[PDB]
Design a protein around this ligand. Structure first.
Ligand SMILES: [Au+]
Ligand SMILES: [Au+]
Ligand SMILES: [Au+]
Lengths: 110, 27, 106, 22
């Protein structure tokens, strides 16, 4: 359209929509983080792990940034990295205990 | 495609390579 | 300041919200990709058997790099599987500890 | 908080690194 009377309000409406759009994305991301966070906390409570291990994992999960999605992503990165480290540590102990018992270990599917 | 997971399993080379994973997890 | 000049000002504002909006998505996609690569290299620096690492990498480079909402869900999935595996190994750990007549603590 | 391996028949000595060795 070309009439000033039509373009201006039309563009105004368009601007209000981009804003509503932008806000929706953020909200949806902050909402996705909230659900993800609670979901992992409940799944964790479902494990047979010792209270001390759970406490330490829940702490890092509960601390994920809930407002900035970019920081949420690095906080998730740090969580995964810490889990991998702990798993690694425990695995070595597992190995030593295996030999100690004259046992063996292998990998399979479930 | 195929619903599954890779797992760690404990074998007893003296029982012929018998899988004692469950037996040991029930301590 | 004429009525007609209101039009060029809005368009400029429209473009901004569009760029900012396109940027937001670009940074998220690059972040996902960067932390995906980052983690995969961290995993290689561990002593974990090749199978365990291969198994974890498979799940990592499996993360959705386009849609952030799905990236988040795959991240949760990766995290859930790590927790479950840790839980299983810990149980095997207590079981072996109890046969070697040892004890564990923190 | 780290996971350690005690030994009741040794005053509960930490045999962790030892075991992680063999
Ligand atoms: Au107007
Ligand atoms: Au709990
Ligand atoms: Au065997």
């Amino acid at each position: 359209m070309h009439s000033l009377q039509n373009v201006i309000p039309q563009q105004q409406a368009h601007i209000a929509e981009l804003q509503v759009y932008n806000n929706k994305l953020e909200r949806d991301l902050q909402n996705k983080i909230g659900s993800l966070t609670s979901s992992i906390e409940w799944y964790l409570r479902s494990m047979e792990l010792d209270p001390e291990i759970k406490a330490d994992i829940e702490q890092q999960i509960n601390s994920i940034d809930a407002i900035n999605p970019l920081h949420a992503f690095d906080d998730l990165e740090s969580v995964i990295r810490n889990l991998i480290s702990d798993y690694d540590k425990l695995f070595l102990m597992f190995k030593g205990l295996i030999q100690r018992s004259n046992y063996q270990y292998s990998f399979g599917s479930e | 495609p195929k619903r599954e997971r890779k797992t760690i399993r404990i074998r007893d080379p003296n029982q012929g390579g018998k899988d004692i994973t469950e037996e040991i997890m029930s301590g």
